[PDB]
C-alpha cells in the first residue's frame, strides 16, 4: 500500500521544478520543494521525521525502482539526476521498522497489480520471474526457505534486469545491501523488524531501563544484562512464555504487532475475516474499559469486533471442547493400554495446548516428544476445522478466509507461525492479535466496551460449555478432561461436576481421584520452572502420575504475556480472572465438553469419532526436536 | 508404463467371450481365456505366477478403475460383472513389490497422458483435482507430506467421484484398503516395498538364513535376531552404513533398487541423463569383469555408460576437488580464528562427506551438529553445480536433466533423498545406482568391461586431480585438504605431495604435521565405532585434534556397502583397491585440488572464491537433530 500513495498524474506533474513526492515512514507524507542547500536528513526533517523516531534504513528512488539510498548518503546533499528517465521524482523512506523482505514482497505485489491493467504493460514479460521471486520471498518470510534460494533470486534478478533494460534492479540491490538481513531471515528464522509475523522473536527495544524484572521473571535464564542498562533476550533459547513482557514496567519487550495486518484485512473488500477468542481474553479485557477483573464481557468484545468489521465472531472454547473430546479419548486409550496392556504405553499424558511449554519441551528434554498428547491446541483445532470444513461447506477456499486468533499469549504467535499448521503456504491461523493489541485497536477506533451494546457470538463455531471455558485458568484443561473421561469410564454422571484439588494456586498441585473402580493421580504445573521440576521427577521415578496439565504462565492463560497489566496485587487480579472463568462455567447449562452440540455435529458429519483416522489427520500433529 | 501394456482395440476386442487381458506383476502378461471353474490364484498360475514369487497384494479392475481385489478374493472364484460398463476386461496385478503410492502416481500420469489427447476426453473436468492428488502423492513419496494431506485426498476423491459419475474411485479405495501403507509412508518415512526411492529403508528379506553376520558387523547394534531365523533391522536407528549388506552372504539385506528407473530414464527420448562416478567405483567394478582389485577401469565404465545411453559421463572426483577447495578454506579460517581468534571457534573440523556418519551424528550426539564442516559432500556439490550452472548455461532446466550418481554406498541414496538437496520437488541427485546394480545392468545388457573399447570422460565436469581421486579410500579426504591448505598457509610447494601417517589401516590414526610454523594434529577414523570413540574422546578432552576425517566403512568408500563382494581376504582386497586409488593419484600430473582448471573456472565465472556468499549458498548445507 506504500507504493500506491501518490497517483501517476501527480507524480508526473513533478517532472521539473525540483518538487519531489515523499512517502513511506515519514510523519507527513506529501509533495514538498527541497531547498538549494539540503541533505536527505534535512528532507526527512522537512517531512516531520519518522513515525517513532526510528533510525533511517533505506530510501527507494521512484515508483519504478531506481536504487536505494543508505546511511552513507544521509549526511550528503541530495543529488538530483537519480530520476534519470521514466521514473517519478519520488522517494519511499524505509526506517528500522521496515523489513526488506516485506518491502520487496509489497513492491512485487504493486508491480503485479499494475501489470493486471494497462499500466506497466511492458512488465508482462517478467511477470513469471517476478512471481517466482515473490514465491521465494514469501518462503523466506515464512521461514521455509533455504540459502540456495538466494542464488535463485540472484539468477532471477539477472534475468529481469537484462530483458527489462533497467539500470537498477530491486532484487539485485537488495542482495547487495541487505544481505545480512536476508541471511538472518533465512538462517536464524528471525525478522529483526518483526514485520514478518512468522519470524517474530522477542526483542528488548531501546527504551529498556535495565530494572532486571524480565531477568528475574525469566524461567530459563534466557535474558542477560546489567543494572540500569539495556538487556538482551537469547531468542534461540527463548520459550516465548511472555513472563518478561508482563514483568516489564516500560513495555520495552516487543513481540511484533499484527494490528496493521488486521486493519488492512478488515478494510479489504470481499475478504472474509473470522475471529476466535480465547477464554482468558473475556475476563481481562474489561479491566482497561472499567470492568472489574473476572467480568465476562465476551458480548462486548463480539460487538466491538463486528463494529470493526469481523464477519464471524467465534470462540476458542469451542475448539477447547473439541480438544477435550480428543484428549479424553486418548487418555482413556492410554489408561486401558496401561492396566490391561503393557509397558509400550506412555504415562502420564501431558497437555499440549500450551505452545510455550511445547517449545520448551522441544528445545530442552527433546527425547520426551512422544509423551505429550498428539492433539492440537484448541486454537489450531478451531483453525483447521474452520479452514477445512466450515469454509469448504460455505464455498470458501482456505485463501479466501482470514482466521484471526485473539489470544492472551505471546507464544500463540509462534504456534500459529509453525509450518505444520499450514497448507500451500496458507496457515490455519493467519496471525495472532494479543489482548493488549485488541485494547489498543478498540481505543483507537473509539469503541468503548463499557457502553457498547451486547451482541451474540456466532453459534456454529462459538457455542461452548463450562468445561471449555475453564481452559483459560490453571487446572481447567485437566478438569475438563477429567469431567469428560471419568463419566464415560464409570458409566454414571457426577452430582458435583467441579473437581476440587485440581484448582488452587500452588506451583504444582497433586490430586487423587477415587471415582469408580479406577484411581487417577493428576498433577498441575503453573510455570515452566514447575514443568522442568516435574519432568525431572518423572525421569527420576520418585513419584508417578496418570495425567499432568502444564501451563507456562502463573495462573494459566489469564496470566498470559499478552494480557493487560494487572492493577493492585497481581496474584489477586489473576485469581479474580480465574474466578470469573469459574463463574462463567457455573452459569452454563452444559458443563461437559462431550455435550457440545456443534462439536458433536462435527464428529457425526465430518469426522467419525474421537481418535478416528480423519480425527487424527485433522486434529493431531507431531513435534520436532531442536 | 504398466497401464499402457495393452491397446484400446485389443482391450475392446474382449467385450464378450470370457477372454481377459492380464498385466502387472505376472510372469507372462497377455490375453488368456479363464476356464469355467477358476479362481484368481488359478488365473495368476495360468499367467505363470508373479515375477519373484512375491505374495499377491492387489488387483486393479480395468484401465478405467473398477475397484481393487484383495487377498480375500484370491481364494474365491473369479466373479464376472466387475466389468460393468465402459471398462476393459483387464486386470493389473499388484504384488508385495508394488507401492500403492507409486501405483496411484502412475495411474494419474496415465490419466493425464490420455487427457492430453482425444482419449478420455471427459476426464478434462477432473484434470486439476487429479493433478493436485498427484502433487500430494508426490509429496508423500518424497517424505515431505503430512497427515492432513490424507484428508485433502479424501476430499479430492469425493469431488472427482461425484462429477465423474463413477462407482469406483481409485483414491477413495486406496484410502480404504491400504491406509496402513499410506500411514507408514507419511509417519515413518518408509516405503516397505522400496519403490519410493526417497523413502528407502534397509530391510532384511525372507531369504535370510540367520547367520548373524549382519548383527556382528552392525556398529550401532541396530539388528535383532536369533540363530538360523530371520533378523530385523531397526530402521529408526539405522545409519545406512551398509556394513550389514557387505557382511550378508545371501544378499538378503535390500536397500531398494533404482535400476528400473535408470533404464526408463535412459530409454526416454529427449531426456538428458548425466552420471557422476565415485572414486571407489572405478577400482572395484573390474573385479566382476575379470580385473584385479585396484585396476582403473573408468574408461571402460564411461564406454559402458555411453553404450547404455548416458548423454554425459562425469566424475565425482571433480566435486571432490570443489569440496576440498571449500573445506581447506574453511579449515584455514577456523585455524586463524583459533590462534588469533578466541573460544568461539570450533575445533577439530570434521569431514561431512560421509552421509552415514552425518546420519549417525544427527541421530546420536545431536548437540554436535555445528562441529562438522558445513560443506556438502562431493556428490551433492557436483549435483547442485550441474543443475544450477552447467544445465542453466546449456539451456536445460533442473527438471530436464536426470542426474544419476554411481556410488559404492548405501547411504548415498539417503543423502540424495534428503529434502534440503532439492528445489521445487526436483532433487539435485535424482537417484543413486550402486556398484552392484551397475554390474548387474552391464551383465544384463551384454556389456563386458574387459573387452569394451576405451572412451574419454567428459572434461567439463569430469576432469579431476590426484587429490580428488584419493577420496575413495580412508584418509584421502583429509590428505587432499592438507595438500591444498598447508601449501597456501606456508607459501611454498612441498616436494613430497603424499602425506604419510594419514595412510594406513588402523581403526583410528593420529598424524602430527610440522610443516612451516604451524602444527596440525590430524585424526582419521575407519568405522562408526571409531567415530563414536573419538567423539567420546573429544567430549572428554583427554586428547586434542585440529581436523578429523570420518568414514563409516572400513577402508573408506572402497569398502562401501554398494561395492561388489570381495574375493579372498577382504582386508587384502580393500587394500588393493586403496592402492589402486593411490596409483591413480600418482599417475596424475595435477595432484592438488586447487589446480583443477574446471573448478577454478567455476570459481572465477560463477562463484567468486571459496567461502564467498554464493559459494556458501550453493555448496554449503545445514544439519537437523533427530
Ligand atoms: N489454544 C488454546 Fe487455549 C484454549 O481454549 C486458549 O486460547 Fe489459552 C486461553 N485462554 C491461550 O493463549 S492455550 C493453553 N490451554 C488453556 S487455554
Ligand atoms: N560424495 C562423495 Fe565421496 C567422493 O568424491 C564419493 O562419492 Fe565416497 C567414494 N568413492 C562415496 O560413496 S563419499 C565420502 N568421502 C570420500 S569419497
Ligand atoms: S519469553 Fe519467557 S522465556 Fe523468553 S525471555 Fe521472556 S521470559 Fe524468558
Ligand atoms: S523489564 Fe523491561 S525494563 Fe526492566 S529490564 Fe527487563 S526489559 Fe528492560
Ligand atoms: S499459558 Fe496460556 S498464555 Fe501462558 S503461554 Fe501457555 S498458552 Fe500462552
Ligand atoms: S546399515 Fe550399518 S547401521 Fe544400518 S543395519 Fe546395516 S550395519 Fe547396522
Ligand atoms: S547376514 Fe544376511 S543372512 Fe546372515 S543373518 Fe544377517 S541378514 Fe540374515
Ligand atoms: S564411507 Fe564412503 S561408502 Fe561407506 S558410507 Fe561413508 S560414504 Fe558411503
Ligand atoms: Zn522480515
Ligand atoms: Zn512407497
Identify whether the C-beta of residue B499 lies closer than 8 Å to the C-beta of residue B482: yes
Chain B contact present for A80, CB below 8 A: no
Give the whole-angstrom CA distance, residue A195 versus residue A104. Answer: 12
Technique used by the depositors = cryo-EM
In a domain, B481, yes or no: yes
In Å, how far is B150's CA from the nearest CA of chain A?
A: 7
Contacts for A338 with CB less than 8 Å, ≥ 6 apart = A345, A347
Composition of chain B by helix, strand, coil, percent to 5: 45, 15, 45
Cα radius of gyration rounded to whole Å, chain B: 27
Indicate the top mutation candidate among B190, B216, B220, B221 to test ligand 6's pocket, ranked by most ligand atoms within 8 A of CB.
Answer: B220
In a domain, B161, yes or no: yes
Rounded to whole angstroms, the maximal C-alpha distance in chain A is: 91
B140 vs B100, B185, B194, B431, B545, CA distance in Å? Answer: 11, 7, 14, 17, 43
- Region of A6 (left: φ > 0; alpha: ψ -120 to 50; beta: rest) is beta
Identify whether the C-beta of residue B431 lies closer than 8 Å to the C-beta of residue B262: yes
Final residue belonging to a domain, choices B232, B256, B280: B256
Identify whether the C-beta of residue B474 lies closer than 8 Å to the C-beta of residue B502: no
Identify whether the C-beta of residue B235 lies closer than 8 Å to the C-beta of residue B220: no
Is the sign of the CA dihedral A265, A268, A273, A278 positive or negative?
positive
Give the whole-angstrom CA distance, residue A35 versus residue A141. Answer: 40
The string of DSSP codes covering A160-223 is HHHHHT-S--HHHHHHHHSHHHHHHHHHS---TTS-STTS---EE-TT-----HHHHH-SS--E
A48 vs A23, A36, A53, A77, CA distance in Å? Answer: 11, 19, 10, 18
Rounded to whole angstroms, the maximal C-alpha distance in chain B is: 91
Identify whether the C-beta of residue B29 lies closer than 8 Å to the C-beta of residue B5: yes
Q: Which residues pair with A407 in a beta bridge?
A: A434
A154 and A300, same domain (yes or no): no
B183 vs A58, A466, A561, CA distance in Å? Answer: 50, 36, 38
Identify whether the C-beta of residue A530 lies closer than 8 Å to the C-beta of residue A580: no
**DSSP label at A246?**
H
B499-502: long-range contacts (C-beta < 8 A, 24 or more apart)?
B502/B475, B502/B478
A392 contacts in chain B (CB < 8 Å): 155
A456 and A599, same domain (yes or no): yes
In a domain, A254, yes or no: no
A438 vs A243, A255, A463, CA distance in Å? Answer: 19, 15, 22
- B428, closest residue in chain A (CA to CA): A148
Q: Which three cell numbers stand for residue B189?
A: 518415512
Q: What are phi and psi of A317, to 5 degrees?
A: -65, -25
CATH code at position B204: 3.30.70.20
- A147, closest residue in chain B (CA to CA): B617
Give the whole-angstrom CA distance, residue A546 versus residue B276. Answer: 56
Give the whole-angstrom CA distance, residue A288 versus residue A297. Answer: 12
B544 and B413, same domain (yes or no): yes
- Choose, out of B128, B136, B150, B151, the residue to mutate when testing the contact with A (most A CBs < 10 Å): B151
Q: Which three cell numbers stand for residue A543?
A: 513419584
Give the whole-angstrom CA distance, residue B474 versus residue B476. Answer: 6
The string of DSSP codes covering B110-147 is HHHHHHTSSTTGGGGGGHHHHHHHHHHHHHHHTT---T
In a domain, B153, yes or no: yes
Q: For residue B38, give the 3-state DSSP assignment.
A: coil
Contact A614 B155 (CB under 8 A): no
Give the whole-angstrom CA distance, residue A388 versus residue A399. Answer: 11
The string of DSSP codes covering B362-431 is HHSSGGGTTSB--BPPHHHHHHHHIIIIIHHHTT--GGGEEEEEEES-SHHHHHHH-TTSEETTEESS-E
B119 and B181, same domain (yes or no): yes
CATH code at position B50: 3.10.20.600
Identify whether the C-beta of residue B422 lies closer than 8 Å to the C-beta of residue B416: no
Q: Which residues pair with B403 in a beta bridge?
A: B274
CATH code at position B605: 3.40.950.10
Looking at ligand 2, which atom is closest to the CA of residue B281? Answer: 10
- Spell out the alpha helix ranges (H) of A282-341: 298-308, 316-336
B60 and B205, same domain (yes or no): no
**DSSP label at A477?**
H
The β-bridge relationship of strands A508-513 and A520-525 is antiparallel
Q: Is B209 exposed, middle or buried (0-12, 13-18, 19+ CB in 10 A)?
A: middle
Distance from chain centroid for Cα B416: 5
Helix or strand holding residue B358 (H, E): helix B355-363
Strand order in the sheet with A508-513: A349-350, A547-550, A520-525, A508-513
B247 and B367, same domain (yes or no): no
Q: Which three cell numbers stand for residue B271?
A: 531426456
Q: Which three cell numbers stand for residue B107?
A: 495411474
CATH code at position A531: 3.40.50.1780
Resolution of this entry in Å? 2.2
Final residue belonging to a domain, choices A153, A179, A205: A179
Q: Is B593 exposed, middle or buried (0-12, 13-18, 19+ CB in 10 A)?
A: buried
Question: Is A23 one of the annotated active-site residues of the chain?
Answer: no
B534 and B583, same domain (yes or no): yes
- Number of domains within chain B: 3
A169 and A275, same domain (yes or no): no
Q: For residue A403, give the 3-state DSSP assignment.
A: strand
In Å, how far is A423's CA from the nearest CA of chain B?
A: 9
Composition of chain A by helix, strand, coil, percent to 5: 45, 15, 45
Among A295, A298, A380, A415, the one annotated catalytic: A415
B16 and B117, same domain (yes or no): yes
The string of DSSP codes covering A44-71 is HHHTT-BTTSPPEEEEEETTTT--EE-G
Contacts for B416 with CB less than 8 Å, ≥ 6 apart = B379, B380, B383, B405, B427, B428, B429, B430, B431, B432
Distance from chain centroid for Cα A186: 19
Cα radius of gyration rounded to whole Å, chain A: 27
Give the whole-angstrom CA distance, residue B583 versus residue A265. Answer: 69
In a domain, A420, yes or no: yes
B contact residues 368-427, partner A, Cβ 8 Å cutoff:
384, 388, 392, 420, 423
In a domain, A235, yes or no: no
Of B240, B315, B328, whose CA–CA distance to B281 is shortest? B315
Give the whole-angstrom CA distance, residue A535 versus residue A529. Answer: 10
Final residue belonging to a domain, choices A179, A210, A232: A179
Instruction: Select the residue of B150, B617, B626 nearest A617 (Cβ to Cβ).
Output: B150
Among A142, A557, A576, A593, the one annotated catalytic: A557
Contact A147 B384 (CB under 8 A): no
B210 and B165, same domain (yes or no): no
User: CA angle at residue B414 from B413 to B416, to 5 degrees?
Assistant: 65
Q: Which residues pair with A91 in a beta bridge?
A: A22, A61
Q: What are phi and psi of B143, to 5 degrees?
A: 75, 20
B180 vs A104, A613, B150, B185, CA distance in Å? Answer: 45, 11, 12, 9
B32 and B74, same domain (yes or no): yes
Looking at ligand 3, which atom is closest to the CA of residue A222? Answer: 8
A98 vs A95, B177, B398, B455, CA distance in Å? Answer: 6, 52, 35, 58
B479 and B590, same domain (yes or no): yes
B503 vs A222, A408, B9, B155, B497, CA distance in Å? Answer: 47, 63, 67, 60, 13
Q: For residue A474, give the 3-state DSSP assignment.
A: coil
Which residue's C-alpha comes closest to atom 4 of ligand 4? A211
Report the binding-site residues of B for Zn(2+).
99, 185, 191, 196
In a domain, A187, yes or no: no
Contacts for A325 with CB less than 8 Å, ≥ 6 apart = A484, A593, A594, A596, A599, A603, A610
* CA A437 to centroid of ligand 7, rounded, Å: 64
Q: Which three cell numbers stand for residue B374?
A: 558445513
Q: For residue A398, give the 3-state DSSP assignment.
A: helix
Give the whole-angstrom CA distance, residue B327 versus residue A497. Answer: 66
In a domain, A241, yes or no: no
Contacts for B491 with CB less than 8 Å, ≥ 6 apart = none
Domain that residue A74 falls in: 2-179
Question: Is B453 one of the annotated active-site residues of the chain?
Answer: no
The string of DSSP codes covering B9-20 is HHHHTTSSSSEE
Of B119, B102, B581, B548, whose CA–CA distance to B368 is shortest? B548
Measured from the Cβ of residue B144, the count of other Cβ atoms closer than 10 Å reads: 14
* CA B449 to centroid of ligand 9, rounded, Å: 57
Amino acid at each position: 500500500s506504500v507504493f500506491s500513495v501518490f497517483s501517476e498524474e501527480e507524480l508526473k506533474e513533478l517532472s521539473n521544478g525540483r518538487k519531489i513526492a515523499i512517502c513511506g515512514k515519514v510523519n507527513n507524507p506529501g509533495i514538498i520543494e527541497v531547498p538549494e542547500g539540503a541533505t536527505l536528513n534535512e528532507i526527512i526533517q522537512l517531512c516531520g521525521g519518522l513515525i517513532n523516531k526510528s533510525n533511517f534504513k533505506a530510501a527507494q528512488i521512484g515508483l519504478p525502482f531506481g536504487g536505494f539510498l543508505t546511511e552513507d548518503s544521509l549526511d550528503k546533499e541530495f543529488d538530483f539526476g537519480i530520476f534519470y528517465e521514466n521514473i517519478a521524482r519520488t522517494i519511499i523512506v524505509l526506517s528500522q521498522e521496515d523489513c526488506i523482505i516485506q518491502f520487496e514482497k509489497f513492491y512485487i505485489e504493486y508491480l503485479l497489480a499494475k501489470i493486471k491493467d494497462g499500466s506497466y504493460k511492458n512488465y508482462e514479460v517478467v511477470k513469471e520471474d517476478i512471481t517466482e521471486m515473490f514465491n521465494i520471498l514469501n518462503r523466506i518470510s515464512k521461514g521455509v526457505s533455504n540459502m540456495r534460494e538466494i542464488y535463485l533470486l540472484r539468477n532471477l534478478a539477472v534475468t529481469v534486469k537484462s530483458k527489462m533494460n533497467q539500470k537498477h534492479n530491486i532484487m539485485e540491490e537488495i542482495i547487495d545491501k541487505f544481505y545480512e538481513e536476508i541471511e538472518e531471515h533465512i538462517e536464524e528464522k528471525k525478522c529483526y523488524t518483526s514485520q514478518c509475523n512468522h519470524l517474530v522473536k522477542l526483542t528488548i527495544t531501546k527504551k529498556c531501563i535495565g530494572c532486571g524484572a524480565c531477568k528475574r521473571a525469566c524461567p530459563v535464564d534466557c535474558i542477560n544484562g546489567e543494572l540500569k542498562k539495556k538487556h538482551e533476550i537469547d531468542y534461540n533459547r527463548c520459550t516465548h512464555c511472555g513472563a518478561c513482557v508482563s514483568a516489564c514496567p516500560v513495555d520495552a519487550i516487543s513481540a511484533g504487532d499484527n494490528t496493521m495486518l488486521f486493519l488492512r484485512d478488515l478494510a479489504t473488500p470481499n475478504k472474509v475475516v473470522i475471529t476466535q477468542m480465547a477464554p482468558a481474553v473475556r475476563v481481562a479485557i474489561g479491566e482497561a474499559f472499567g470492568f472489574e477483573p473476572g467480568e465476562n464481557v465476551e458480548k462486548k468484545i463480539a460487538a466491538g469486533l463486528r463494529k470493526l468489521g469481523v464477519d464471524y465472531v467465534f470462540d476458542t472454547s469451542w475448539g477447547a471442547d473439541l480438544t477435550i473430546m480428543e484428549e479424553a479419548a486418548e487418555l482413556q486409550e492410554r489408561l486401558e493400554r496401561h492396566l490391561a496392556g503393557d509397558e509400550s504405553v506412555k504415562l502420564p499424558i501431558l497437555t499440549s495446548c500450551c505452545p510455550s511449554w511445547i517449545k520448551f519441551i522441544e528445545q530442552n528434554y527433546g527425547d520426551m516428544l512422544d509423551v505429550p498428547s498428539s492433539a492440537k491446541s484448541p486454537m489450531e483445532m478451531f483453525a483447521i476445522v474452520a479452514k477445512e470444513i466450515w469454509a469448504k461447506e460455505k464455498g470458501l477456499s482456505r485463501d479466501e478466509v482470514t482466521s484471526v486468533a485473539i489470544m492472551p499469549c505471546i507464544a500463540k504467535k509462534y504456534e500459529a507461525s509453525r509450518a505444520e499448521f499450514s497448507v500451500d503456504m496458507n496457515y490455519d491461523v493467519d496471525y495472532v492479535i494479543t489482548t493488549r493489541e485488541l485494547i489498543k485497536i478498540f481505543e483507537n477506533s473509539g469503541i468503548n466496551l463499557k457502553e457498547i451494546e451486547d451482541e451474540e457470538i456466532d453459534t456454529v463455531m462459538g457455542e461452548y460449555t463450562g468445561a471449555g471455558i475453564i481452559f483459560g485458568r490453571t487446572g481447567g484443561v485437566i478438569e475438563a478432561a477429567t469431567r469428560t473421561a471419568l463419566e464415560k469410564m464409570t458409566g454414571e454422571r457426577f452430582d458435583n461436576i467441579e473437581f476440587e484439588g485440581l484448582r488452587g494456586w500452588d506451583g504444582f498441585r497433586v490430586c487423587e481421584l477415587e471415582a469408580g473402580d479406577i484411581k487417577l493421580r493428576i498433577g498441575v504445573a503453573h510455570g515452566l520452572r514447575e514443568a522442568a521440576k516435574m519432568l525431572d521427577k518423572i525421569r527420576s521415578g520418585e513419584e508417578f502420575f496418570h495425567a499432568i496439565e502444564i501451563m507456562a504462565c502463573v495462573g494459566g492463560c489469564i496470566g498470559g504475556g499478552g494480557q493487560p497489566k494487572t492493577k493492585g496485587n497481581k496474584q489477586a487480579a489473576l485469581q479474580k480472572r480465574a474466578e470469573g472463568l469459574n463463574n462463567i462455567d457455573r452459569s452454563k447449562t452444559l458443563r461437559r465438553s462431550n455435550e457440545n452440540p456443534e462439536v458433536l455435529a462435527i464428529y457425526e458429519k465430518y469426522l467419525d469419532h474421537p481418535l478416528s483416522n480423519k480425527a487424527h489427520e485433522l486434529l493431531h500433529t507431531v513435534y520436532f526436536p531442536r
